Amino acid sequence: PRRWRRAAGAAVLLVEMLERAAFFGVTANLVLYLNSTNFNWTGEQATRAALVFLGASYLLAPVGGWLADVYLGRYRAVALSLLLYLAASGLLPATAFPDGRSSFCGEMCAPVLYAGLLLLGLAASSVRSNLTSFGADQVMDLGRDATRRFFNWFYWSINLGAVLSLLVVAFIQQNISFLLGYSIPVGCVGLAFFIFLFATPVFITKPPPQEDIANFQVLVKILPVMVTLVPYWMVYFQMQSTYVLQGLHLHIPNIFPIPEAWLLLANVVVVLILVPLKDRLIDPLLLRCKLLPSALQKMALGMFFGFTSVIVAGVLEMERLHYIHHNAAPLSIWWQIPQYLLIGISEIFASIPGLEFAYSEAPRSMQGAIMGIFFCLSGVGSLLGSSLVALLSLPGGWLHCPKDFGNINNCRMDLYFFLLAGIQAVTALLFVWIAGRYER
Amino acid sequence: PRRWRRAAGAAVLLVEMLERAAFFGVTANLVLYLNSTNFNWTGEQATRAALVFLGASYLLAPVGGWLADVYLGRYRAVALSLLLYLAASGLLPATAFPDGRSSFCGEMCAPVLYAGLLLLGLAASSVRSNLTSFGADQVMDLGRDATRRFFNWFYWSINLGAVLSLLVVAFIQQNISFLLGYSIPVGCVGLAFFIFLFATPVFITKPPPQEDIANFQVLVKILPVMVTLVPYWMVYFQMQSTYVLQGLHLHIPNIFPIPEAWLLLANVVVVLILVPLKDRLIDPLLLRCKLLPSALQKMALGMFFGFTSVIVAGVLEMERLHYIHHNAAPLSIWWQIPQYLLIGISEIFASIPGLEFAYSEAPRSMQGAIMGIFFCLSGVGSLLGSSLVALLSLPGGWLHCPKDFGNINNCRMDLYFFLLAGIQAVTALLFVWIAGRYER
């Protein structure tokens, strides 16, 4: 933050959002190619595979980020991750040209796609973690309140990138043609790379025994606060789709003139609108009223808000069943915005304070490793939630509600929501206990 | 515990259970007299008034116990409380003889009954608190593990006294006559007084500025751990009758050949059977496995078990509604024993560890005052739960379920149980946070 800290922050947000846009675009492209050409298994997949692949990328995040911050530094880490992303996008014409497929699976299609997906996930996770490290370093050199404001703006920028990614890739790859849909990801990657390189003067670079052993004493005390986050992220990730399912069971209103995937972007626009209001209002009052939420009580309050959101969701579910018992209806579809706002509040109070706390136990030897493992927490939670949903769907029944739009089945939505509330409350109690042990 | 510590403990348990028996008997007698003779308001009461009067006695407990332990000592405190109880039982023949009523409300019935009830509550609360103080002193002079064992046995003895009280007063006052029903309470009071006086050699008596101010520093830090217990006791006390209501909505089975009040005694026999098993099994394993629940994590685990019991109750409620939706039935009435056992586990892990912790912050200047205020917590919780039930019954509807046996009304049992689970989870989170602050 020498003189253009606003410019540096804007460049970081732009490159992050463009990287996310390219990530979603190339993932959708390769998934469509795999489902299309031969790929004997065909993946048996048409939608939602993007979520599980993002979870796998977060799963690969810890080791890749650790390698980046140990044997590559911090600037070379993002440079090489973006170069590997260029390699993936230059492999993309092989997906485009039929000669590429003929040369790939005409000999020893599947293995090359596996290698490309692995490299793509590694590069995306590494660049995300190291961009977070760069931004945190710059704004910690700027100021602590500035650090919190930048973290909120960074999460908001990630959400904005996800929204723009979804809309732009859908429009380009479904409206005009395919070659433009191939040049758009490489184009945004190239312009983000040029933005990054143009911002290298204002960016501050950093250089890459008993101290390593002492770091294990920090790891063994900071891990329990983060492993207990796995159940919370699990609950939140299945809620992310259960809210969409609940809205699908309701009668959508017709006001002011893909629908099933639109609620996923609604959950993102909710955060897109809360973070500005939060940044401009809550922080000044949270500083003048002296609540003293020193990066851990904020997280506990976020998970308490998540529990309250589950409470509101269960109340709405029981209200829906009560109307059916009265003797199909919107069932107060306009009463889902309060619970969506509550879950967005929980998300913003658990992610940004989570990053801030992960940088409280930062010490600069493996600062990116802790970010990689924190994102691995969310990845593990999403993957385990998806596995639980699959287990309760086909043989379970609890998650088989979408079939027959939840008319006659063993849906047990009330039971699922109540058990989810119990799990969230147990997670909150564990988090409070572990936080109490942490300060000791 | 010189040589007959078993005898001293048995005498304390016997006098406590007999005092509770006389308490219930005389309360029922005076309530019946008030409802019967004229008492223009008539109380508008036939049953459940005993619970609210016990709550009022606990409400009077703090000030009376503080007076007892400040201006009377500890042995004179129980002596004078039992003497006041003798005064109440000697006022009882005025209730019996019509000449007593004619002399009471033939001039300036109501005021004398009010004074008698006030004195009875004061004496009962004072003797309960000071008996607890005596037992704790003796067994703390014996041993800490012995102190926990004695606390468990003391709660078990209170439950046994309640059961024997209910059965004996019902049988005597409904089967044979009234004069025997009048001599039974005075008889058990007299024999308990003689047991107490006969045990005075083995009993160890104790004698009755800046230190008082320093006690306020202890009070301001031990109160928050106990005020947060008010919501928990509130939830548990309305659960104590909501479980009975739920069992009433079920089809009772006919196996091995007042019914609505029998579940109240079932909730007591559940504790009557858990405390022996708990004492004989859990404590040795809790000491060999080294869980280290130093009188506070035990309380947190008790309230977590209470939350789990609410979870099981909600699961059962949703199961009951699901069968109705399937298209009255027992609805797994035998599946209420697990939730009753879980609520008994919560009660035993929240009361006995609660007493043990209240004696951890004992320092011997107002040791009985903290016991009086701890019982005042339960009294306030019971009274507030009863007020909430009344508010949700007549105009609310949530507690109006008993009318028409919950067939067609605004019962909202699912909503009530889910909101109760939310309140219990919030109470648990507050208790964990306050406990974390307590050790600091």
Residue B406: C-alpha distances to residues A425, B245, B335 (Å): 30, 9, 20
| Cβ density class A237-259: b for 16+ within 10 Å, e for less | bbbbbbbbbbbebbeeeeeeeee
The rounded distance, in Å, linking the Cα atoms of A57 and A51 is: 10
Do A27 and A94 form a contact (C-beta atoms < 8 A)?
Answer: no
- Please identify which residue in the block is written with the tokens 């996923």: A264
The rounded distance, in Å, linking the Cα atoms of B17 and A168 is: 77
Chain A CB contacts of B419 under 8 Å are 311, 315
Chain A CB contacts of B307 under 8 Å are 422, 425
State whether B418 and A314 contact (CB < 8 Å). yes
Burial of B71 (0-12, 13-18, 19+ CB in 10 A): exposed
Do A400 and A393 form a contact (C-beta atoms < 8 A)?
Answer: yes
Amino acid at B158: I
Do A24 and A166 form a contact (C-beta atoms < 8 A)?
Answer: yes
The rounded distance, in Å, linking the Cα atoms of B310 and A426 is: 13
State whether B422 and A321 contact (CB < 8 Å). no
The rounded distance, in Å, linking the Cα atoms of B197 and A198 is: 94
H/E element, B172: helix B144-175
Q: What is the nearest CA distance from A326 to chain B, expressed in angstroms?
A: 10
The rounded distance, in Å, linking the Cα atoms of A185 and A193 is: 12
- Please identify which residue in the block is written with the tokens 């308990």: B192
Do A92 and A28 form a contact (C-beta atoms < 8 A)?
Answer: no
- Residue A200 has phi, psi (to 5 degrees) of -65, -25
The rounded distance, in Å, linking the Cα atoms of A154 and B54 is: 58
Q: Apex CA B35: angle with CA B33 and CA B38, to 5°?
A: 85
The rounded distance, in Å, linking the Cα atoms of B79 and A254 is: 78
Q: Which of A314, A418, A429 sits opposite B432 (nearest CB)?
A: A429
Q: Which of B314, B412, B429 sits opposite A429 (nearest CB)?
A: B429
Question: Count of alpha carbons within 13 Å of A399, Cβ hemisphere only?
Answer: 20
Torsion, Cα of B154, B158, B159, B164 (10° steps): 130
Amino acid at B215: N
The rounded distance, in Å, linking the Cα atoms of B273 and B276 is: 6
Burial of B6 (0-12, 13-18, 19+ CB in 10 A): exposed
The rounded distance, in Å, linking the Cα atoms of A429 and A307 is: 11
Do A26 and A120 form a contact (C-beta atoms < 8 A)?
Answer: yes
The rounded distance, in Å, linking the Cα atoms of B129 and B31 is: 24
Helices vs. strands in chain B: H and E counts, helices first: 15, 0
- Tell me which DSSP letter residue B439 carries: T
The rounded distance, in Å, linking the Cα atoms of B189 and B182 is: 12
From the candidates A429, A430, A437, A438, which should be mutated to test the interface with B, based on the most B CB atoms within 10 A? A429
Do B129 and B364 form a contact (C-beta atoms < 8 A)?
Answer: no
Do B50 and B264 form a contact (C-beta atoms < 8 A)?
Answer: no
Question: Count of alpha carbons within 13 Å of B233, Cβ hemisphere only?
Answer: 22
Nearest to A226 by CA among A156, A292, A293, A296: A296
- Determination method here? cryo-EM
Q: What is the nearest CA distance from A382 to chain B, expressed in angstroms?
A: 25
3-state secondary structure of B120: helix
- Tell me which DSSP letter residue B404 carries: G
3-state secondary structure of B261: coil
3-state secondary structure of B293: coil
Nearest to A119 by CA among A64, A177, A194, A198: A64
Closest B-chain CA to A301 = B429
- Name the token pair of A304: 């308490």
Q: Which of A318, A426, A435 sits opposite B415 (nearest CB)?
A: A318
Per-residue H/E/C for chain A = CCCCHHHHHHHHHHHHHHHHHHHHHHHHHHHHHHHHCCCCCCCCCCCCHHHHHHHHHHHHHHHHHHHHHHHCCCHHHHHHHHHHHHHHHHHHHHHHCHHHHHHHHCCCCHHHHHHHHHHHHHHHHHHHHHHHHHHHHHHHHHCHHHHHHHHHHHHHHHHHHHHHHHHHHHHHHHHCCCHHHHHHHHHHHHHHHHHHHHCCCCCCCCCCCHHHHHHHHHHHHHHHHHHCHHHHHHHHHHHHHHHHHHHHCCCCCCCCCCCCCHHHHHHHHHHHHHHHHHHHHHHHHHHHCCCCCCCCHHHHHHHHHHHHHHHHHHHHHHHHHHHHHHCCCCCCHHHCHHHHHHHHHHHHHHHHHHHHHHCCCCCCCCHHHHHHHHHHHHHHHHHHHHHHHHHHHHHHCCCCCCHHHHCCCCCCHHHHHHHHHHHHHHHHHHHHHHHHHHCC
Do A51 and A145 form a contact (C-beta atoms < 8 A)?
Answer: no
Question: Count of alpha carbons within 13 Å of B361, Cβ hemisphere only?
Answer: 27
The rounded distance, in Å, linking the Cα atoms of B215 and A80 is: 65
- Name the token pair of B243: 């479980």
CATH node for A1-208: 1.20.1250.20
3-state secondary structure of B292: coil
Burial of A216 (0-12, 13-18, 19+ CB in 10 A): exposed
- Residue A362 has phi, psi (to 5 degrees) of -75, -20
Count of beta carbons in the 10 Å neighbourhood of residue B203:
19
- Name the token pair of A144: 């602590």
- Please identify which residue in the block is written with the tokens 């939060």: A278
- Name the token pair of A94: 């092989």
B438 touches chain A (CB under 8 A): no
**C-beta pairs of A190-196 under 8 Å, 24+ apart in sequence:** A190/A86, A191/A18, A192/A14, A192/A15, A192/A18, A192/A19, A192/A22, A192/A82, A193/A15, A193/A82, A193/A86, A195/A11, A195/A14, A195/A15, A195/A18, A196/A11, A196/A15, A196/A78, A196/A82
Give CATH 1.20.1250.20 domain extents, chain A. Answer: 1-208, 210-440
The rounded distance, in Å, linking the Cα atoms of B22 and B377 is: 23
The rounded distance, in Å, linking the Cα atoms of B199 and B4 is: 10
The rounded distance, in Å, linking the Cα atoms of A26 and A85 is: 10
Chain B CB contacts of A307 under 8 Å are 422, 425
Breaks (C-N over 2.5 A) in chain A follow: 108, 208, 257, 327
The rounded distance, in Å, linking the Cα atoms of B371 and B390 is: 29
E strand residue ranges, B343-384: none
**C-beta pairs of B236-239 under 8 Å, 24+ apart in sequence:** B236/B306, B236/B343, B236/B346, B236/B347, B236/B381, B237/B378, B237/B381, B237/B382, B237/B385, B237/B386, B238/B385, B238/B386, B238/B388, B238/B389, B238/B420, B239/B309, B239/B310, B239/B313, B239/B343, B239/B420
Q: Which residues contact A119 (CB under 8 A, 6 or more apart)?
A: A84, A87, A88
The rounded distance, in Å, linking the Cα atoms of A40 and A31 is: 14
The rounded distance, in Å, linking the Cα atoms of A295 and A285 is: 16
The rounded distance, in Å, linking the Cα atoms of A438 and A433 is: 9
A433 touches chain B (CB under 8 A): yes
Closest A-chain CA to B440 = A440
Sort residue B47 into left (φ over 0), alpha (ψ -120 to 50) or beta.
Answer: beta
- Residue A105 has phi, psi (to 5 degrees) of -100, 15
| End-to-end alpha carbon distance in chain A | 35
Count of beta carbons in the 10 Å neighbourhood of residue A180:
12
Q: Which residues contact B201 (CB under 8 A, 6 or more apart)?
A: none
| Helix B144-175 × helix B110-142 angle, to 10° | 150
Do A351 and A201 form a contact (C-beta atoms < 8 A)?
Answer: no
Do B169 and B24 form a contact (C-beta atoms < 8 A)?
Answer: yes
Do B215 and B417 form a contact (C-beta atoms < 8 A)?
Answer: no
Sort residue A412 into left (φ over 0), alpha (ψ -120 to 50) or beta.
Answer: left
From the candidates B301, B318, B398, B408, which should be mutated to test the interface with A, based on the most A CB atoms within 10 A? B318
Q: Which of B325, B418, B428 sits opposite A429 (nearest CB)?
A: B428
Q: What is the nearest CA distance from A216 to chain B, expressed in angstroms?
A: 25
- Name the token pair of B215: 């006690």
- Tell me which DSSP letter residue B422 carries: H
Cα A4 to its chain centre, rounded Å, is 29
> What's domain B209-440's architecture?
Up-down Bundle (1.20)
Secondary-structure class of domain A210-440 per CATH: mainly alpha
